[PDB]
Amino acid sequence: ATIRPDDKAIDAAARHYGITLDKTARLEWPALIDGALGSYDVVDQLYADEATPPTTSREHAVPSASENPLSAWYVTTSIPPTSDGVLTGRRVAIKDNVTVAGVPMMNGSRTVEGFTPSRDATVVTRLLAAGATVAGKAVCEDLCFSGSSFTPASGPVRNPWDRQREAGGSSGGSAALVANGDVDFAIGGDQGGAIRIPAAFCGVVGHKPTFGLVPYTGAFPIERTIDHLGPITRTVHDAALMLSVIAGRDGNDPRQADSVEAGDYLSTLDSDVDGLRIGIVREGFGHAVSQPEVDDAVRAAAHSLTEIGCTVEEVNIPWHLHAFHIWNVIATDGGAYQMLDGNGYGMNAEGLYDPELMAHFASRRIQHADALSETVKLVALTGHHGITTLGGASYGKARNLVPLARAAYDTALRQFDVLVMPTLPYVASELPAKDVDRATFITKALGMIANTAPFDVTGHPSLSVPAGLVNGLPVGMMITGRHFDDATVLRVGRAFEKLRGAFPTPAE
Amino acid sequence: ATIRPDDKAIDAAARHYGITLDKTARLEWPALIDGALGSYDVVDQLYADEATPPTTSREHAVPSASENPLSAWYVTTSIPPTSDGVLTGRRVAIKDNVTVAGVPMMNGSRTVEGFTPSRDATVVTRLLAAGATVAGKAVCEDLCFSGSSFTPASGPVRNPWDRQREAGGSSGGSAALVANGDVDFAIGGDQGGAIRIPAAFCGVVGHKPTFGLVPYTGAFPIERTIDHLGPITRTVHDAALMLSVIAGRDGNDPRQADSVEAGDYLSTLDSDVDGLRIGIVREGFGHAVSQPEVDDAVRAAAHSLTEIGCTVEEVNIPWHLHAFHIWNVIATDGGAYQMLDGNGYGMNAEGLYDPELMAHFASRRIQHADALSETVKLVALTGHHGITTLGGASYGKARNLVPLARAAYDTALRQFDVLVMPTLPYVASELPAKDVDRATFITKALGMIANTAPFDVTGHPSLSVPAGLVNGLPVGMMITGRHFDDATVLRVGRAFEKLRGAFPTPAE
Ligand SMILES: NC(=O)c1ccccc1
């Protein structure tokens, strides 16, 4: 039977809604609530007899500090493919916010550490059926609300290019492992740039596909309308190969529209880009907070594409700066409402839920809230203000502005094939000391998402490709295009790779 | 600029998440939260300069007790059509939970009374462009969480067949007006049976279309996955005519899938039903709480269809009883989470929001929570328990069971064209005294949704058609069919009408 609430809880519930119970109310509600909970009892029973996922027996190990030099691994594994395919012989690291049945996961947070899922996320299942070997779970920022790599409760991920500098984030671990050569590919998540940012910082390729293309099923949600799963690879070709395996509706993710279909990211990957219009978004350069050397390197990189027949011109998209603030509201109000109060999955959406995870997270986060990262706490405090005092109006206003933001980019996309700008306005900085300032902490973890975040809310596919080195550190060029035109975005990235030439390895 | 929270609020927010602020935290957060709110300021500005709906000048009047004999009207109007069409010369009443720009609305609740929307719901706009004249707003149950007609803060709606008995609900007012002949049609909402129930009680036709067919845009939400808007009419033909005008994607309702398309509900409305298989769902009859006279009348009505070439057989669908409990969890946890904590619209879904309404509702419901109906309070208390203590797990479990419920009905629908059972297990009962028992109140307002509610969660189109009189009071036969096969559901309803013959008017 489902647990019933006690009188103290009933009173707390009533006070939550501003309801005042008299003496007779406090006496009757219990029995009534108990009657209502009768349906919950039935759901509990039906769920136990019909929707309880099977058990799993897979092995894993906590690597020793020696076999985990960058602190990029949470746990290691060797899960064999179920069929041979285009990934046979390759290894893949899975971001810790993504479930792998029978394997522990914590999503870089103390509020989740200790959870062992019963289901494999859809992308995990597709990877295995393509011949890949899942090599383990890669550490991710505390509940992923961080653009750097110092919020993981298990410690900071070191960049393989400079073990003193950040690996980025929130998929810091994934990129590090890929850059360091520990795995061939990695599955990363992107809500404000978590796939593109660490890739840029670690000198690897990161693709946040068109929203809804890759099923999110099985990954810990943050805010439903901006959740993205995607590939982090060493090369554009591999990124396209991974996408061909993971893309496509799975019938369990409400984010995916009925019309979603996997495109062809390989057939024309190497086709010439002669005649393609490349738009350099002005608002993507010269931010108050930035390193000009970085912007110029990427700017030069963008223009060099003329060397292969591309017409390159600058274009103004004022809404690019507006989109950031619209994203921030959606991520702040939405994140606190869903990720926290809704315990990850939230409610009011059709699809496959993870009630085991929801329960686990619910208890742990209230007993370890103080351990939550400073950025998550910021989201919590201000979002709660947005949800209650503000009545959710700001979230509503932001939602009503999204179409305008989308249209602003699509208009530019009628004049250009793809839009380009620096992925990040600066190279990986040194890791802060575990004595950091709350204010510094929040600015150093959220000040590099200005160009990436906008595309999370509008949903356009956005790709980060290494564009060169600045003071020995990797910088990235971000190529963004039309919804579901991931193929063209990848083609341009590929074409740029050929022109740019082989990009150095942190081991080189 | 967006209102900032004070230290007391910041502390309350922190306590809400189990976060404990020290002395320095209480000192720093303010400035940080203020910085975060900077994005809200920008959203506020952009929204004011670009997404603020125009002003409106329409007239309305509060009818006198004399011109509002059944207490079915909230306010009356005479909004002329914008174009001539299939509804020219007809009047339509709009349920009070549905916005009509420039006109007051309260959704039968004290927590909303006083609100005047700036946008017209999509169905309102479509009705006007089809030649209809909007005659006013029809009273609906307190926040619609009631299957009867005694929860409206403005008083109970009297059934035109017996002004001492309930008109049903939550669209009680709409059905009453239609039955009484005050209007030709009405737009009603259905979350647990609000369109079908009052129609059945008042002897009129009520159609809860396939989920997602009719845009919900502009109507006050309860729980996103079970929200439905539909027509309430005097005849099946009119119901089909209305559906042809309101059905179809509007690009603003996240509930509507990309593949949704309006069907043809008129071409074959009068075609012969010779050979159609009609399945009498056993679990839809003989409930512990019910009036056998009612079940037999409907049972006999269902069999009479053989008189026109239909093959009629009984079929077992055990999941019909399970679906009720699955619905209850989704409506209880989901309703408290979205309708209350989310102030109607909630979050984490793409679409057109009503931030003005969200703000208004947010302030009013905390100052008038004690005025909320007993059923809403039940939802509030137990749902809050589900959201917090239960961690939302029950909601998740219920969601994971929905497909099985859907499949159970679809399997029956492979053996039969449509499924039939009584809309309600009993005729309209006498109105309770404003001295009612909380327990009685909750059972008398929620004990008649056993057959209707299941279809709200699975989404199948479900139609209630008058099947006869029992002790002088109307009883209804509910015809339910496949997703988006509203046309066949209507055809059967039509065919039954012809056979049954003209149904008496409460004025006859
Ligand atoms: N990289 C991300 O997805 C991110 C999300 C939220 C805040 C910062 C970064």
Ligand SMILES: NC(=O)c1ccccc1
């Ligand atoms: N008729 C309805 O939609 C309803 C919803 C909730 C509870 C009772 C009835």
